[PDB]
Design a protein around this motif. Structure first.
Motif, mmCIF file in Angstrom:
data_model
loop_
_atom_site.group_PDB
_atom_site.id
_atom_site.type_symbol
_atom_site.label_atom_id
_atom_site.label_comp_id
_atom_site.label_asym_id
_atom_site.label_seq_id
_atom_site.Cartn_x
_atom_site.Cartn_y
_atom_site.Cartn_z
ATOM 1 N N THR A 67 0.786 -1.305 0.162
ATOM 2 C CA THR A 67 -0.036 0.093 -0.087
ATOM 3 C C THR A 67 0.865 1.210 -0.078
ATOM 4 O O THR A 67 1.914 1.310 0.640
ATOM 5 C CB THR A 67 -0.845 -0.048 1.314
ATOM 6 O OG1 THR A 67 -1.570 -1.210 1.506
ATOM 7 C CG2 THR A 67 -1.930 0.787 0.994
ATOM 8 N N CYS A 68 0.443 2.438 -0.704
ATOM 9 C CA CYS A 68 1.122 3.585 -0.915
ATOM 10 C C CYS A 68 1.309 4.273 0.463
ATOM 11 O O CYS A 68 -0.062 4.371 1.169
ATOM 12 C CB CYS A 68 0.562 4.328 -2.061
ATOM 13 S SG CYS A 68 1.389 5.985 -2.244
ATOM 14 N N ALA A 69 2.332 4.722 0.978
ATOM 15 C CA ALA A 69 2.496 5.351 2.239
ATOM 16 C C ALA A 69 1.840 6.705 2.334
ATOM 17 O O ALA A 69 1.650 7.372 3.258
ATOM 18 C CB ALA A 69 3.787 5.427 2.696
ATOM 19 N N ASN A 70 1.509 7.321 1.147
ATOM 20 C CA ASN A 70 0.847 8.672 0.749
ATOM 21 C C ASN A 70 -0.719 8.511 1.489
ATOM 22 O O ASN A 70 -1.269 7.512 0.810
ATOM 23 C CB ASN A 70 1.035 8.995 -0.561
ATOM 24 C CG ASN A 70 0.384 10.421 -0.923
ATOM 25 O OD1 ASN A 70 0.193 11.179 0.197
ATOM 26 N ND2 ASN A 70 0.146 10.849 -1.955
ATOM 27 N N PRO A 71 -1.263 9.093 2.253
ATOM 28 C CA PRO A 71 -2.707 9.002 2.704
ATOM 29 C C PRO A 71 -3.420 9.390 1.685
ATOM 30 O O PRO A 71 -4.430 8.841 1.711
ATOM 31 C CB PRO A 71 -2.539 10.039 3.733
ATOM 32 C CG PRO A 71 -1.370 10.017 4.382
ATOM 33 C CD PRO A 71 -0.181 10.187 3.140
ATOM 34 N N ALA A 72 -2.911 10.175 0.650
ATOM 35 C CA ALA A 72 -3.855 10.714 -0.550
ATOM 36 C C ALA A 72 -3.933 10.042 -1.696
ATOM 37 O O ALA A 72 -4.566 10.141 -2.532
ATOM 38 C CB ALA A 72 -3.583 12.255 -0.888
ATOM 39 N N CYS A 73 -3.184 9.011 -1.528
ATOM 40 C CA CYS A 73 -3.240 7.950 -2.871
ATOM 41 C C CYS A 73 -3.615 6.495 -2.228
ATOM 42 O O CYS A 73 -4.630 6.006 -2.613
ATOM 43 C CB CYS A 73 -1.710 7.616 -3.194
ATOM 44 S SG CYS A 73 -1.596 6.768 -4.798
ATOM 45 N N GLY A 74 -3.215 6.070 -1.277
ATOM 46 C CA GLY A 74 -3.359 4.585 -0.652
ATOM 47 C C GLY A 74 -3.824 3.640 -1.927
ATOM 48 O O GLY A 74 -4.168 2.654 -1.592
ATOM 49 N N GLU A 75 -2.760 3.609 -2.841
ATOM 50 C CA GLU A 75 -2.987 2.732 -3.827
ATOM 51 C C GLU A 75 -1.655 1.560 -3.641
ATOM 52 O O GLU A 75 -0.823 1.909 -3.353
ATOM 53 C CB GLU A 75 -3.144 3.238 -5.364
ATOM 54 C CG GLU A 75 -4.171 4.392 -5.530
ATOM 55 C CD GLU A 75 -5.267 3.887 -6.126
ATOM 56 O OE1 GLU A 75 -5.826 2.886 -5.034
ATOM 57 O OE2 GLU A 75 -5.828 4.040 -6.887
ATOM 58 N N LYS A 76 -1.893 0.546 -4.544
ATOM 59 C CA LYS A 76 -0.841 -0.660 -4.330
ATOM 60 C C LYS A 76 0.075 -0.367 -5.297
ATOM 61 O O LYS A 76 -0.088 0.216 -6.510
ATOM 62 C CB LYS A 76 -1.612 -2.074 -4.750
ATOM 63 C CG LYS A 76 -2.636 -2.169 -3.592
ATOM 64 C CD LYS A 76 -1.786 -2.916 -2.290
ATOM 65 C CE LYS A 76 -2.607 -3.456 -1.379
ATOM 66 N NZ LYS A 76 -2.821 -3.292 0.004
ATOM 67 N N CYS A 111 5.156 4.814 -6.730
ATOM 68 C CA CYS A 111 3.853 4.214 -6.986
ATOM 69 C C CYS A 111 3.372 4.548 -8.341
ATOM 70 O O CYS A 111 3.516 5.838 -8.984
ATOM 71 C CB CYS A 111 2.922 5.046 -6.028
ATOM 72 S SG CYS A 111 1.150 4.569 -5.986
ATOM 73 N N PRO A 112 2.706 3.819 -9.234
ATOM 74 C CA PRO A 112 2.169 4.253 -10.397
ATOM 75 C C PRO A 112 1.086 5.357 -10.187
ATOM 76 O O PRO A 112 1.050 6.284 -11.283
ATOM 77 C CB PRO A 112 1.531 2.894 -10.988
ATOM 78 C CG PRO A 112 2.113 1.812 -10.195
ATOM 79 C CD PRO A 112 2.449 2.224 -8.836
ATOM 80 N N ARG A 163 5.974 8.137 4.917
ATOM 81 C CA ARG A 163 4.935 9.213 5.102
ATOM 82 C C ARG A 163 5.403 10.341 5.262
ATOM 83 O O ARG A 163 4.741 11.529 4.938
ATOM 84 C CB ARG A 163 3.874 8.841 6.234
ATOM 85 C CG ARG A 163 2.394 9.331 5.970
ATOM 86 C CD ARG A 163 1.469 8.749 7.192
ATOM 87 N NE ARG A 163 -0.044 8.369 6.562
ATOM 88 C CZ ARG A 163 0.135 7.177 6.114
ATOM 89 N NH1 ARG A 163 0.959 6.246 5.819
ATOM 90 N NH2 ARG A 163 -0.992 6.872 5.472
ATOM 91 N N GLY A 164 6.617 10.666 6.059
ATOM 92 C CA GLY A 164 7.128 11.688 6.524
ATOM 93 C C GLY A 164 7.772 12.325 5.324
ATOM 94 O O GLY A 164 7.716 13.890 5.320
ATOM 95 N N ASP A 165 8.692 11.864 4.781
ATOM 96 C CA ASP A 165 9.646 12.488 3.596
ATOM 97 C C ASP A 165 9.277 11.727 2.229
ATOM 98 O O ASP A 165 9.620 10.775 2.081
ATOM 99 C CB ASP A 165 11.060 12.353 4.131
ATOM 100 C CG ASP A 165 11.869 13.415 3.505
ATOM 101 O OD1 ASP A 165 11.219 14.164 2.631
ATOM 102 O OD2 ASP A 165 12.975 13.314 3.704
ATOM 103 N N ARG A 166 8.426 12.295 1.853
ATOM 104 C CA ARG A 166 8.015 11.714 0.106
ATOM 105 C C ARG A 166 8.742 12.556 -0.776
ATOM 106 O O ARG A 166 9.091 13.656 -0.570
ATOM 107 C CB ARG A 166 6.375 12.045 -0.163
ATOM 108 C CG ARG A 166 5.645 10.906 1.039
ATOM 109 C CD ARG A 166 5.603 9.650 0.403
ATOM 110 N NE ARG A 166 4.968 9.466 -0.935
ATOM 111 C CZ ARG A 166 4.741 8.128 -1.251
ATOM 112 N NH1 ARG A 166 5.194 6.995 -0.588
ATOM 113 N NH2 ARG A 166 4.330 7.957 -2.392
ATOM 114 N N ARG A 167 9.183 11.859 -1.796
ATOM 115 C CA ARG A 167 9.703 12.518 -3.194
ATOM 116 C C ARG A 167 8.831 11.925 -4.227
ATOM 117 O O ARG A 167 8.235 10.993 -4.462
ATOM 118 C CB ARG A 167 11.145 12.364 -3.296
ATOM 119 C CG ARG A 167 11.465 10.707 -3.278
ATOM 120 C CD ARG A 167 12.774 10.594 -3.609
ATOM 121 N NE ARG A 167 13.387 9.427 -3.166
ATOM 122 C CZ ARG A 167 13.659 8.482 -4.093
ATOM 123 N NH1 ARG A 167 13.745 8.565 -5.142
ATOM 124 N NH2 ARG A 167 14.409 7.503 -3.612
#
Ligand SMILES: [Mg+2]
Ligand SMILES: [Mg+2]
Ligand SMILES: [Mg+2]
Ligand SMILES: [Mg+2]
Ligand SMILES: [Mg+2]
Ligand SMILES: [Mg+2]
Ligand SMILES: [Mg+2]
Ligand SMILES: [Mg+2]
Ligand SMILES: [Mg+2]
Ligand SMILES: [Mg+2]
Ligand SMILES: [Mg+2]
Ligand SMILES: [Mg+2]
Ligand SMILES: [Mg+2]
Ligand SMILES: [Mg+2]
Ligand SMILES: [Mg+2]
Ligand SMILES: [Mg+2]
Ligand SMILES: [Mg+2]
Ligand SMILES: [Mg+2]
Ligand SMILES: [Mg+2]
Ligand SMILES: [Mg+2]
Ligand SMILES: [Mg+2]
Ligand SMILES: [Mg+2]
Ligand SMILES: [Mg+2]
Ligand SMILES: [Mg+2]
Ligand SMILES: [Mg+2]
Ligand SMILES: [Mg+2]
Ligand SMILES: [Mg+2]
Ligand SMILES: [Mg+2]
Ligand SMILES: [Mg+2]
Ligand SMILES: [Mg+2]
Ligand SMILES: [Mg+2]
Ligand SMILES: [Mg+2]
Ligand SMILES: [Mg+2]
Ligand SMILES: [Mg+2]
Ligand SMILES: [Mg+2]
Ligand SMILES: [Mg+2]
Ligand SMILES: [Mg+2]
Ligand SMILES: [Mg+2]
Ligand SMILES: [Mg+2]
Ligand SMILES: [Mg+2]
Ligand SMILES: [Mg+2]
Ligand SMILES: [Mg+2]
Ligand SMILES: [Mg+2]
Ligand SMILES: [Mg+2]
Ligand SMILES: [Mg+2]
Ligand SMILES: [Mg+2]
Ligand SMILES: [Mg+2]
Ligand SMILES: [Mg+2]
Ligand SMILES: [Mg+2]
Ligand SMILES: [Mg+2]
Ligand SMILES: [Mg+2]
Ligand SMILES: [Mg+2]
Ligand SMILES: [Mg+2]
Ligand SMILES: [Mg+2]
Ligand SMILES: [Mg+2]
Ligand SMILES: [Mg+2]
Ligand SMILES: [Mg+2]
Ligand SMILES: [Mg+2]
Ligand SMILES: [Mg+2]
Ligand SMILES: [Mg+2]
Ligand SMILES: [Zn+2]
Lengths: 120, 214, 122, 62, 114
Positions: free
Chosen positions: D28-37, D44-45, D53-57
């Motif tokens: 599962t994507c660590a981005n809360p606003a994506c949540g996609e596999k 993440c595609p 979750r803290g440091d996304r790029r």
RNA sequence: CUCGAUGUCGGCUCGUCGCAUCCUGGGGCUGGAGUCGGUCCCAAGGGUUGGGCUGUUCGCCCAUUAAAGCGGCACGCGAGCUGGGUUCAGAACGUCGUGAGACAGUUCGGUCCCUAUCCGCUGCGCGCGGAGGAAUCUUGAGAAGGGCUGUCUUUAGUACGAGAGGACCGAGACGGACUGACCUCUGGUGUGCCAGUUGUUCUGCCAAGAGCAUGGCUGGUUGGCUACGUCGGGUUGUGAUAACCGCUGAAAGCAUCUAAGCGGGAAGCACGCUUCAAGAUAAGGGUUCCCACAGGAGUGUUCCUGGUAAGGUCCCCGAGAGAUGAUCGGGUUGAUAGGCCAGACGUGGACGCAUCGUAAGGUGUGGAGCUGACUGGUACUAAUAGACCGAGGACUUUCA
RNA sequence: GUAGCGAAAUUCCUUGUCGGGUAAGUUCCGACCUGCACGAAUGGAGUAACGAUUUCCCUACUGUCUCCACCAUGAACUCGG
RNA sequence: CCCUAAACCGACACUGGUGGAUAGGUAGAGUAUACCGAGGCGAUCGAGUGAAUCGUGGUGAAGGAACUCGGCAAAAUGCCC
RNA sequence: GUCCGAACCCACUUCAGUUGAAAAUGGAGGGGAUGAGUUGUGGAUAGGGGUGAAAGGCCAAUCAAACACCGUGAUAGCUGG
């Protein structure tokens, strides 16, 4: 840097030499490149050596970098934009991230980019 | 049946010195570091006498609860490698006893056991010393070939133990009657005259020479 | 290393000029002869006026190998030609003069006349 | 060489059943606003992102 | 590692002169002969230096009685009483193997600072 | 048996078995004085060379060696190789035939296919099991390997011998062949490192460079791999024996190694040495770890699902590992790899500048510059973040 | 059966015998004549030059070999079609 | 429109065959070979991976035909004055 | 009907290929290469016949008598069903 142990890219060591030079030049020209996992992981050391040479700006250094690359626009970018960007960075000027696979041949792709933010 | 002294160590590489007769000797350098007695096997409980020694530094997060309990019973800090030494005088060792490289003196003959370097799948020519065929004189695509592998109808089979291609290396090897050149006990360093099995950084068991010497 | 069919120069004044190694003496299946090793040879070249004639089967001791010789002190000696000194069947030179430098390996309790007659022993 | 006999159904199926793949595992994507596999250690595609979750790029603008 | 180097430091010498391949060098080598010990001098041109710690070694080539003789000495061997440098040659490489195929004036080296 | 094909001579390669033993080991008898032998009794552990001639096998010869064994395995071995010989078509000689032609007569030339299904064999994995689930170290039923040998000195110029000659039994030193590991040394490699250099094309040009020509070529070369290299090994020994030698001893008042009984005795046998090994389903042993969960149907509680503990695996960074599986180490509580810094190795004196020369170029600045694998540091980059599997006090019986 | 040739692209015995070449040569090269079973236009004996013909020798050269090692590549191996 | 060919002859969009013409530069005797021009291509499955092994190249200590039926293959030589 | 050597013609050796890239080729060398040379276009010779610097060679990818059709459902003391 270190040799590649196993069979070379492109079916010949000369072609791998050329491929790695072109790939590093394209990475410097664009800042990031989608180039399959093995090519990115193989061009990371050469590109990092080139950036480290470009960190210090002299005519001899620019000529030595121009031995590789061989495109003076890329040399200008490397000694004017990329090189000053890593003044306090001691190594690790690039990063590689896996991106997925190609549909046609299942080749695992990756993105190699030059670190974009200043260390300070 | 036999009484054996022993220590555990790490292969560090090879160097050379000149002895008192100005003869160049090749020496393997062995970090024969501190070994603790982590278990004692007795005829009463295990049916045989031995000393299970521990050697090496390990990250505490990489040791498990069973391993932590074993070392806690021994009363020692966890070690990376546990190796048993079969000796008739295992009764003289105590749990947690510290065994250093000075178990051996400056002219002791020792047996060194280690896992040899690996070569992957080798052919018959490399792993068994086979001669192939000639490079020329008609030889047709069989230069490095095993040749015949049996007879005929009698027996209609390849005999067991025929030497064939396969994976070679990474096996237990003991080199016998190696002279200890020197022991630096405070830093746990051992200079042993000769070449020992394994790559640099591999675990070595140094024991008393079973056949004393030649 | 000297093997069968190796042709050596002669460091003697016996009149022989070239020897062909027929056999390396010292044991069965023995392959190579080094400094101090005795070989059976045939005279491929001889001085027309001389006591050793072409086609003669003689015994020689090897000096001056091209390859190299290791010594216990870790040093190596090397020459530019392969050379041999003819023997009389007891370990004594047929000739009376030794030419060129001679390996110290000959002075291993065995070949004393060759060492004494040598101009340089190395 | 050439096969001496027709392979039996039992032996043919014994060998053929081992020609198989494994299911892709997905995380599962660590981005809360994506949540996609997405694949582990892969951007993440759906959001083109990477990291905790803290440091996304952002790796892909897609 | 560094432990190997510090072990090797005990077998090194400190009286070794500064010489390169191409230099003319006298090697005083002690030879044990019967009960006697003598010092025999091997004089010639340094044609190689294979480097590294106590594994340092150098090869000296000499022209004796119409034949070439080369000797490879470990630089820190105890068999060397001293090494003397006679001339300092002027060469363009680190391995003078081509000198094996030369003689006469074609074998003589220049002098450094000429 | 096979003609709806069982390929054949010799060699190469790889072996394995027999003993009718060539060497080495043990012994009896000698027309065995000693050194050497002859002969026949044990004995198959290891070993048993390289060449000249010939297609050969065989054989003769050369130089050795302790010795250069004899045989079987489709005269072992062509889905392993060769193809020199033999049995195709061409051609010539001799001979035979009127001739077409012929010859176990010679002579020159003359297509040797196959991607391995099954058993077999060499290696490497997955699964299940090993009456709970695991981690770690192990025992050894059994299996495999290894087992060769010479010269010299001494005992001792002793014993023996008319002399010549010249030991056994013991002690030691150095070897040949074989073999295990290793890369410190030496040698080889080097598509990578440094340098030089020819032809050409290009970076606008000078300068400085780059592409191609086998890495264009040439000279070196760290790391890895490796032998031509370096270290080590065969064993001292033990038990039962073989041929053989006996002790005591009758039957058979003597005699007799045997019938009762006891003992010496071989490189052979089984151990000793090295290695594999609990699928040894007889599935072993020690130590340590986690533990009495949840819900259904139930039917001696059964059994099936579900979330977990200890522990692992997926995934990522790698190598001391590797075809792939596997193995080993690391994953931010981190030096695992790269980069960076420093050193070592390697190369051999970078660019620029100054200076001398008409110029090619020389000299200095300056062991300069470059630089891989080796070493030591250093979180700059990537090892993110997460998932999934995995017991239940673990069937039953009798003991205690 | 002459001249000439002859162990020969012919010789069974045969690796004939003698000499040369080699350390060692059933091949070779020169002879001998005992021509199983040469011979004069199915030509005899020679012959400079020529030959991807056959044969023997010397030298140079080499991984042909002693004895193989290492490097890169197209397959082989893994993944997708 | 193709045309020393993916369109012709070869069953194929086949490492084969197919007559003629134009055919530049530097090095070179050259229309050989090397690198380029005019012009045209990157070739019609890819991505990886230091297994053995096979093919194709490269190097090699000392020796130098000891290989082998046989110097097969390779190396050596090589051009101009 | 000279010599070395490209194009061109050929095919001596070797390696590969041998369910090939190819029902005869590819790589590396090799022979001829002003001649009895090679090649395009059209033409002539036809099966007991052609043609053959001669191998029983070639006559549309198997020639000691082509191919097609017909006699014909040849015949087979043989094999098979
Ligand atoms: Mg490499
Ligand atoms: Mg590929
Ligand atoms: Mg190139
Ligand atoms: Mg070979
Ligand atoms: Mg081949
Ligand atoms: Mg067969
Ligand atoms: Mg099966
Ligand atoms: Mg150096
Ligand atoms: Mg059949
Ligand atoms: Mg017998
Ligand atoms: Mg046996
Ligand atoms: Mg047979
Ligand atoms: Mg033939
Ligand atoms: Mg015929
Ligand atoms: Mg007639
Ligand atoms: Mg057992
Ligand atoms: Mg090293
Ligand atoms: Mg070297
Ligand atoms: Mg210029
Ligand atoms: Mg060349
Ligand atoms: Mg090396
Ligand atoms: Mg009696
Ligand atoms: Mg069993
Ligand atoms: Mg005859
Ligand atoms: Mg004859
Ligand atoms: Mg004769
Ligand atoms: Mg007439
Ligand atoms: Mg006639
Ligand atoms: Mg007539
Ligand atoms: Mg003639
Ligand atoms: Mg596939
Ligand atoms: Mg085509
Ligand atoms: Mg065209
Ligand atoms: Mg077509
Ligand atoms: Mg044509
Ligand atoms: Mg031109
Ligand atoms: Mg051309
Ligand atoms: Mg153009
Ligand atoms: Mg075009
Ligand atoms: Mg293609
Ligand atoms: Mg393509
Ligand atoms: Mg296509
Ligand atoms: Mg080289
Ligand atoms: Mg060589
Ligand atoms: Mg050489
Ligand atoms: Mg020679
Ligand atoms: Mg021969
Ligand atoms: Mg010969
Ligand atoms: Mg032979
Ligand atoms: Mg040839
Ligand atoms: Mg050649
Ligand atoms: Mg002509
Ligand atoms: Mg001609
Ligand atoms: Mg023709
Ligand atoms: Mg017509
Ligand atoms: Mg005919
Ligand atoms: Mg036809
Ligand atoms: Mg017919
Ligand atoms: Mg007819
Ligand atoms: Mg009719
Ligand atoms: Zn997302």
């Amino acid at each position: 840097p270190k040799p590649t142990k196993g069979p070379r890219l492109g079916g010949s060591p000369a072609h791998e030499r050329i491929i790695l030079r072109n790939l590093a030049s394209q990475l410097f020209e664009h800042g990031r490149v989608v180039t399959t996992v093995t090519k990115a992981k193989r061009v990371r050391p050469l590109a990092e050596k080139l950036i480290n040479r470009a960190k210090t700006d002299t005519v001899a250094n620019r000529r030595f970098v121009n031995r590789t690359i061989t495109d003076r626009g890329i040399v200008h970018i490397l000694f004017t934009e990329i090189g000053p960007r890593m003044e306090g960075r001691d190594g690790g000027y690039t990063r590689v991230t896996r991106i997925g696979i190609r549909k046609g041949d299942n080749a695992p792709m990756a993105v190699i980019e030059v670190i974009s933010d200043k260390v300070a | 049946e036999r009484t054996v002294k022993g220590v555990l160590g790490t292969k560090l590489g090879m160097t050379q010195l000149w002895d008192e007769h100005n003869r160049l000797v090749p020496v393997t350098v062995i970090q024969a570091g501190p070994c603790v007695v982590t278990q004692v096997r007795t005829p009463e409980t295990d049916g045989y006498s031995a000393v299970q020694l521990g050697y090496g530094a390990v990250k505490a997060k990489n040791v498990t609860k069973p391993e932590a309990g074993h070392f806690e019973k021994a009363g020692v800090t966890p070690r990376r490698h546990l190796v048993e030494l079969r000796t008739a005088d295992a009764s003289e060792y105590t749990l947690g006893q510290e065994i250093a490289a000075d178990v051996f003196s400056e002219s002791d003959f020792v047996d060194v056991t280690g896992t040899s370097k690996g070569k992957g799948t080798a052919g018959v020519m490399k792993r068994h010393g086979f001669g192939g065929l000639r490079a020329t004189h008609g030889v047709h695509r069989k230069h490095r070939s095993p040749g015949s592998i049996g007879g005929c109808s009698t027996p209609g089979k390849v005999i067991k133990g025929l030497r064939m291609a396969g994976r070679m290396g990474v096996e237990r090897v003991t080199v016998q009657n190696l002279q200890v050149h020197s022991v630096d006990a405070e830093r746990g360093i051992m200079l042993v005259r000769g070449a020992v099995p394994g790559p640099k950084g591999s675990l070595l068991v140094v024991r008393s020479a079973a056949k004393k010497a030649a | 290393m000297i093997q069968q069919e190796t042709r050596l120069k002669v460091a003697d004044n016996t009149g022989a000029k070239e020897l062909l190694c027929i056999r390396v003496l010292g044991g069965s299946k023995r392959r190579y002869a080094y400094l101090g090793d005795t070989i059976v040879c045939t005279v491929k070249d001889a001085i027309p006026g001389g006591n050793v004639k072409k086609g003669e089967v003689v015994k020689a001791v090897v000096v001056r190998t091209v390859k190299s010789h290791r010594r216990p002190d870790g040093s190596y000696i090397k020459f530019d030609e392969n050379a041999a000194v003819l023997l009389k069947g007891d370990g004594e030179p047929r000739g009376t003069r030794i030419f060129g430098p001679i390996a110290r390996e000959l002075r291993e309790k065995k070949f004393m006349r060759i060492v004494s007659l040598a101009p340089e022993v190395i | 060489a050439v096969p001496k006999r027709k392979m039996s159904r039992s032996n043919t199926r014994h060998r053929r059943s081992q020609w198989k793949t494994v299911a892709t595992k997905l995380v599962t994507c660590a981005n809360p606003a994506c949540g996609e596999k997405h694949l582990p250690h892969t951007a993440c595609p759906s959001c083109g992102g990477y990291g905790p979750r803290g440091d996304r790029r952002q790796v892909v603008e897609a | 590692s560094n432990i190997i180097d510090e072990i090797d430091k005990a077998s090194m010498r400190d009286d070794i002169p500064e010489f390169r391949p191409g230099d003319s060098v006298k090697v005083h080598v002690k030879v044990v002969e019967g009960s006697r010990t003598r010092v025999q001098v091997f004089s010639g041109i340094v044609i190689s230096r294979t480097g590294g710690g106590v594994q340092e070694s150098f090869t000296v080539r000499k022209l004796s009685f119409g034949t070439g003789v080369e000797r490879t000495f470990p630089l820190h061997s105890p068999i060397i009483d001293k090494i003397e440098v006679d001339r300092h040659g002027a060469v363009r490489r680190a391995k003078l193997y081509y000198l094996r195929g030369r003689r006469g004036k074609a074998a003589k080296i220049k002098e450094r600072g000429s």
